[PDB]
Structure formats: structure tokens, C-alpha cells
């Protein structure tokens, strides 16, 4: 759809952040959307970089792709510019074959929009414990 | 966390599906958990595979995979073979300095994108931004 | 332009139809932008791919293209059975001007809503 | 159909243009029939010409062509100085019906009056 | 951002010209966004070609190109060819860590020093400093 | 022309700035002029280096050339001497053919000096949005 200012309600581990998402323009290369934090330091922004797919000669199967970025800016012993320390990346690549009806697709988004709410992973990744 | 009934609810394009995910043990020569479908034909299960890393690697590697194959029987069979299989695959990768207020940023992040107008135009209608 | 929802209204033999079209993102390695139908399903999907070009001679190509679903004996997923396609290839020279540009296309545009292509068109007659 | 003066109306740009076609015969080498401008000097006539085929396939193709005059500096016969043209072929399975052939058409004939194709064409801005 | 007509106003030597840059899209091989002019001959266009760029590389380029090509008729013909073409180029370059002030200052000083009488000096007349 | 105390005013995003140039004389190895800033610490100076050329044996065609460049000094965790953390670079490159008229030459000038004034360029240099 037309990109906008996705505004991301109640996130966090407590569970009340908001995280406004501005719209910073397709890269005509290869096909790339961005969304990018209000923060006005273009170094130390949340990125959001979804990306749907076509089949080529080479796939021939739908890749939506989602990667979001979040670098923590931490400054150092004496300056003025903060610099990236960490960077916590994440990656989530569909893969819908060419016959996928739409309640086939509107499925796996909303199973995995629902196990990273479920307490089996958010022990997996808020505290790194494997699955035991 | 031990594995269970991960019981997730209110799932589909309507909203109103359950998927009742039983564990199917940790595979022991990769640290791969496992999840599956409670339906009892193992071809045709719903499969999750969460499985966090450590370094040998100098970063962590929190790994989600889900799985749906779908059932379509033939011009004349019993067994109902796997015709298309819907994947995915989440892997986040948080540095050994992160806090737990920045990996449970990232990952109620991603659970808000995937409910936002703009990814259930991008995945369930395959619309580019 | 930018790509957007065209929606192209009042098509068919009747003359009351609609036709939404979604963009569906420039494809990089040859130029070619898409357009698709919201039908969800995409083998059965019309197709429309507007391409421009550059040189020693212009080149805007549109193509569309229309599959037809029709389930089998006994299935679940409808196949393509036919496949209507289109294809026009404008062709400009380094000088030609906007209303040069501009009279070819409308010219194309009410040639195919005259009475001698929707003879030779939807009902295959010759000239 | 039978070829006749094919009065295309509300052309151009702005959209206030007329063009009468009148018919200009049958070739008997390829079955390509033919159309011209009324315009008395057979090197400057705006031409259209619609063919349609017969198989493995239907090939309806539709070509005009639009030579512009430019009088040289001092002589009596203008020259053709650019060559505007166009080309749509499609292609129709042998199973065809007639709304999903009358569909095609009436698509094309809607997507060179949107706003994608009066941008892309006109002006040739690509998507 | 979204490419519009631009309409730079109050150009020229004298200072009252005006210039209307339609949009000519964005290539997609390269990233590099176009203008021209309205001028209905498309090889005696004014274009102005910007592209901001991305670390592969590990510093921005907002990198402008004007270009103005000279039309003149030739000892009798009938379609003007490009005798003369005179170009230009801007390449800023800023670094991963540059804040909205420091860019914001290089492109209004270059924007203030080309309308200053050293180089209203240096570029309409090839004097050297 | 003369180097003279290029006093450049109305600069910066807000718009109220200014910005003195000092001459600092012109190379001989390769006719580069130069313009600093009055900011005494030489290793912290705005430098502007305008040049103009000659056709060569391999050229035949001008070449006016200004370079401006801005480092950002920041004291480290400890120090007395601010070092350079970033460096802001410009560069444009005319080139006018040997036939180039006066108003040929002084409406690329001028052109360029509104482009980076119109609100597709400070949004494509502020804010490094691309074209969209």
C-alpha cells in the first residue's frame, strides 16, 4: 500500500512505548520500502525496510521481507557526537508460493504475529533461553 | 522457557482461528526446538521450530521458523499429498552487550508490524510499498 | 508518474465494468513497472506491465494480459485454461513532440472504441 | 467489418482534434487492410492499419503511423522529417471468448486515457 | 522527496528568467531522479538529474547534475542539432554521523557562494580567483 | 576577481547565519584560489577553494571548480586540542565549452543557486531523502 507514518502502539517489555515510523521512499534498485524514527540523527534511527518479491527467472515463488534495525547510541568518555555501539537487527522473510490464496498468507502473518506474544517466545528473545 | 501447548489464538485474515501447537522435542544435534499441529497426519502439520544460539559466532541468533503445508487430494487417492508449502522465517541476531529492553523492542516490534496496514497489504495481498 | 491504484472504469462488452489495479513495484532489471489486479490469487491475476525507454529511438510498451480460471473435474486450486494477451509498443523519435506524442495515443484510444475494431477485435472479422 | 470513413473524434492533447480515416483497401499479399487521412499528398496521410490472423494462435494488430511535414529551407514539396509510430498486437487463444476479447480491448482503450499512460506516453516519464 | 514541477524563479544574468522542471521519473538502475525542461524537443532539454546515494561505500553522495544544450540551426535544415552543452556538478559527500545543521550548511553556503561577486566573477566570465 | 572577505550571510537551515571567508591566497602549482574561516585553529577552518582552468592539450573546455568543506571539531574524553570527528564536503564542477555567451555561463550559475534553494534539494540534502 501507500506508505505512511506507521504509528507502532504498545510495544516494549513493559508494554507501553509508541514508535512512529516516517516514510523515507522506495529504493528504485531493487525494490526496497523504508520507514525510518522521527529521531533527527540519521545515524541512531529505528529502520523498517519491508520489501515484496516477484517471481524471476531464478525463484519463481513470493518473498515478503521485512528487516528491522535498531542501533543504540551511547556516548563516549568526552565528545558530542553519540556513536552506534550495539545494533539489534531483525529479519523475517516470507515465502508464498505462486497458487497462495489470501487466507493461506493472512495465516502465517498472524501465527508469527502471535507466537512473539506468546510466552514461549518472549523467553526466547527478551532472556536468550532456548527452548527447555 | 520449557516446552508446551502453545495454544495461539485469534490468528487468520477474519481473526478468529485457534492453532493448538504441541511440543515435538529439541533436536539434539542443532538445538532446534520444535512445535507442530495437534492434526495427526506428520506430513501435513503446521510446523514451528524456534532455536536461540550463542557464540562460537561472536553474536546471538534468536531463530523462528513456521511451516504450512496444504492438503489437496488428487483425481482419485487416499493419502492427501502436500501440494504448495508456506514458509517463513524470523532471525533476529542481538549483539552480546544487549539489553532486555532492546531484544523485547525488536521483537514487539516485529509483532506490531505484522498487524499494521502496511504488512497485511504486503504479505497477504503480495501489494509492494 | 508515480504508480498508483489505477482504476480503470467502464470496460467491457457492455460498457460496466471496473478493473482496480494495484502497483506492483518496478521490476530493476529491465525498467518494466507492473500493475495487478487485487484478486488474490496471484496465477490468476491481470496483468498490466507499462514499460518506457531510451536509447536511438523511443520505445513506451504497454502489455496486459488476462488469465482465465477454470476448476477441473474435481480439484481445489483453479488452473489458467487460456490466456488473452495485448500488447502495444509505442515508438518515438528523439525530436517528436508532446502533441505528436499525445496524438498517437489518443488516436490508439479511439480506434479501438471505433466500429471497425470492435468487429475485428471481439469478434474476430476481418477488415 | 466493412471498411468506411472511420471518424475518430475528440482527440489530441487537449482534446478538441478530429481525424476521418478514409478507407484505403485490403492488401491481397498479407490481409493487411488499410486506413488514411484525407489529407491530398500520399507521403504526409496519417495511417492505420488493422489485420487481423488466423492460426496456432489469433493475432489481432493494429498499426498507425503519423509523419509530420517540415518545409525545407526554400523548396515546394514538404519533406517527412519525424515518423510517430505505434503498434498493438494481441493475441487471442483459439478458445476465446468474446467478453474476455472484448475485455482486452476495452482495457487497453482505459489504460491509454489514465493518468499512468497520459504520463508516460505524452511526456515520457516512466513509472 | 516527491518529485513536483519545479519552478525555479529569478534566473539569468540579468536576474528575471524562470525555468519549469517537469518531473521525468526515477531511473531505477542507478537511483538517479530526473527534470526537464517543457520544451517539446527532448534532445534540446534543460535536464537536472539528483541522486542521494547510500553506504555500499560508507558515506553519502547527494550528487546534482545540471545540463543546458544549445540549439542552433544549421545552413538549412529543418530540426535544430546540439551545438554547444554546458554542463555542471555537484557532489556533496557527508558522513554516517552528520547532523540536519551540518548538511544544511554546506548546501546554503555553495547556494551563497554562487551568487557571490567571486564567483558571479569566476564562472559567467573565466576569470580565476 | 580580487580575494576579498567573502562575507556569505543568511546561511544554515533556520536561515540566520553568517559566515566570514578570510583569502588565504592562491596555490601556484595548480591555480587554486582559497577562502577560510577567521576561526583561529587551522586544522578547524570552513574552506572554500575556487579554480578556474585554461583548455590544455587534452581539456578544450573550462573547467570553474569550488570546493567548500566543513569539519566539526569535538573534544575527546579528556584532551585540550578538539580533533576532526566528521568532514562535510561539497564539490561543483562546471564546464562551459569554448563558445559559451555570458548568459549562457551566468544561467547554470543561477540555476544551481536556486535548485539548492527549491524544496527538492533541501530534502535531498537535509534530510538525504532521494527523489520520490
Redesign the interface.
Given at each position: 500500500?501507500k506508505?505512511?507514518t506507521?504509528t507502532?502502539?504498545?510495544?516494549?517489555?513493559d508494554?507501553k512505548?509508541t514508535?512512529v515510523l516516517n516514510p523515507?521512499?522506495?529504493?528504485?534498485?531493487?525494490?526496497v520500502?523504508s520507514?525510518s524514527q522521527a529521531g533527527?540523527?540519521?545515524?541512531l534511527e529505528?529502520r523498517?525496510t519491508?520489501?515484496?518479491?516477484?517471481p524471476?527467472r531464478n525463484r519463481k515463488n513470493?518473498k515478503?521481507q521485512?528487516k528491522?534495525q535498531?542501533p543504540?547510541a551511547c556516548t563516549?568518555?568526552?565528545?558530542?557526537?553519540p556513536?552506534v555501539?550495539?545494533?539489534?537487527?531483525?529479519?523475517?522473510?516470507?515465502?508464498?508460493?505462486?497458487?497462495?490464496?489470501?487466507?493461506?498468507?493472512?495465516?502465517?502473518?498472524?501465527?508469527?504475529?502471535?507466537?512473539?506474544?506468546?510466552?514461549?517466545?518472549?523467553?526466547?528473545?527478551?532472556?536468550?533461553?532456548?527452548?527447555?
Open positions: 500500500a506508505l505512511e506507521v507502532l502502539g504498545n510495544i516494549g517489555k508494554g512505548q514508535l523515507r521512499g522506495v529504493n528504485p534498485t531493487n525494490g520500502a520507514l533527527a540523527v540519521p545515524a529505528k523498517v519491508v520489501s515484496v518479491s516477484q524471476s513470493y515478503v521485512v528491522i535498531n543504540t563516549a568518555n568526552g565528545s558530542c557526537d556513536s555501539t550495539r545494533q539489534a537487527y531483525a529479519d523475517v522473510t516470507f515465502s508464498f508460493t505462486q497458487y497462495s490464496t489470501d487466507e493461506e498468507r493472512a495465516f502465517v502473518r498472524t501465527e508469527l504475529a502471535a507466537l512473539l506474544a506468546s510466552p514461549l517466545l518472549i523467553d526466547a528473545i527478551d532472556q536468550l533461553n532456548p527452548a527447555y
